[PDB]
C-alpha cells in the first residue's frame, strides 16, 4: 500500500502574554505518533503510538532538540513577518509549517512536501521538483531570495528523498501490526420518521481505519448524490473514524434504496438496506 509521513508545526503569538505557543505533531498516514507543546512543564517530544516507544533515549533527545530549535526559529520568524507585512506588535499571528513525504507500495519516494503559511494563507512552498519555490506574495519573495541564496531546496531534497523515506519505512515495519492493517467499517442502516409520509434512512460506517472511505446511497441502482446528506469524516478517539450518509425516502419505498460502502479493509464493497 502507499503511505505518508508528515510533521505539522504551529506557533501563535500572544503579545503581552509571554512568548508564542508552539505545538508540533507527527503523523504516519492517519496515525498520530509524536507531539511537543512548548507550554508543557519541561517540554520533551513524547510518543503517542506504541511502535515509536522503542526508540532509545538518543532518538528522543535529538527530536527534543529539534522541537525546541523550531520553537525558537518560529519566534524569530513571527518577528520577521511583522516587518514584512508592516504590522504592529499588538496582534496575535499564526505561523504554520508542514513537511514530509509520500511513498509507494515498494517504498520509493512518490512526492515530498515542505510548505509555510502565515495567518492561514499560503506563504512559500517547495515545488514538487524539490528544487524551486512558489512564493505567494512579495514578502515571501524576500524569503525565497534568502532560501535560494542558501540553497535550502537542496537541503530539503536530500532530507525528503533520504531520511524522510528511510525513517517512514522503519516506522511502517515497527508499526506493522497497526499501520499496515486497514480496519473495515462496521455498518448499519437506521430509520428516522419525519412524518407519516417520509423518513430519513441513515447509513453508518463506524470503526474504520484509515479515514479514506466512500459512502453513497442509490435508488433503484441510480446514484442519489444531490439528495444525500453526507457528514464529514470524524475521529472516534480510538484511532478509528466514523461517517454517515442519509437520504429522505417516502414511506414504504425503503427497499428501493441501497447504501454502498467502499473501504480498503472490506473483503468486498458492501451493499446494505434498511432491515425492519
Amino acid at each position: 500500500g502507499s503511505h505518508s509521513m508528515r510533521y505539522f508545526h504551529t506557533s501563535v503569538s500572544r503579545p503581552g502574554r509571554g512568548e508564542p505557543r508552539f505545538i508540533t505533531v507527527g503523523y504516519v498516514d492517519d496515525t498520530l505518533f509524536v507531539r511537543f507543546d512548548s507550554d508543557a512543564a519541561s517540554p520533551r517530544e513524547e510518543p503517542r503510538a506504541p511502535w515509536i516507544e522503542q526508540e532509545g533515549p538518543e532518538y528522543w533527545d535529538r527530536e527534543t532538540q529539534i522541537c525546541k530549535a523550531k520553537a525558537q526559529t518560529d519566534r524569530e520568524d513571527l518577528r520577521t513577518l511583522l516587518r514584512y507585512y508592516n504590522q504592529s506588535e499588538a496582534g496575535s499571528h499564526t505561523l504554520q509549517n508542514m513537511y514530509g513525504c509520500d511513498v509507494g507500495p515498494d517504498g520509493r519516494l512518490l512526492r515530498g512536501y515542505h510548505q509555510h503559511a502565515y495567518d492561514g494563507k499560503d506563504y512559500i512552498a517547495l515545488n514538487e521538483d524539490l528544487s524551486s519555490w512558489t512564493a505567494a506574495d512579495t514578502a515571501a519573495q524576500i524569503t525565497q531570495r534568502k532560501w535560494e541564496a542558501a540553497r535550502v531546496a537542496e537541503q530539503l531534497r536530500a532530507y525528503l528523498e533520504g531520511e524522510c523515506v528511510e525513517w517512514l519505512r522503519r516506522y511502517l515495519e515497527n508499526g506493522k501490526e497497526t499501520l499496515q492493517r486497514a480496519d473495515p467499517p462496521k455498518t448499519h442502516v437506521t430509520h428516522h420518521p419525519i412524518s407519516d409520509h417520509e423518513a430519513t434512512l441513515r447509513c453508518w460506517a463506524l470503526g474504520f481505519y484509515p479515514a479514506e472511505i466512500t459512502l453513497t446511497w442509490q435508488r433503484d441502482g441510480e446514484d442519489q448524490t444531490q439528495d444525500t446528506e453526507l457528514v464529514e469524516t470524524r475521529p472516534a478517539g480510538d484511532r478509528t473514524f466514523q461517517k454517515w450518509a442519509a437520504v429522505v425516502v417516502p414511506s414504504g419505498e425503503e427497499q428501493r434504496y441501497t447504501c454502498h460502502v467502499q473501504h480498503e479493509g472490506l473483503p468486498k464493497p458492501l451493499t446494505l438496506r434498511w432491515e425492519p
Binding site: I66, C67, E76, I124
Partner: peptide, 9 residues
C-alpha cells in the same frame, strides 16, 4: 524522524 537543520524566513 525530523530534519535537523534550522530554517528562518
Amino acid at each position: 524522524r525530523r530534519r535537523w537543520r534550522r530554517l528562518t524566513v
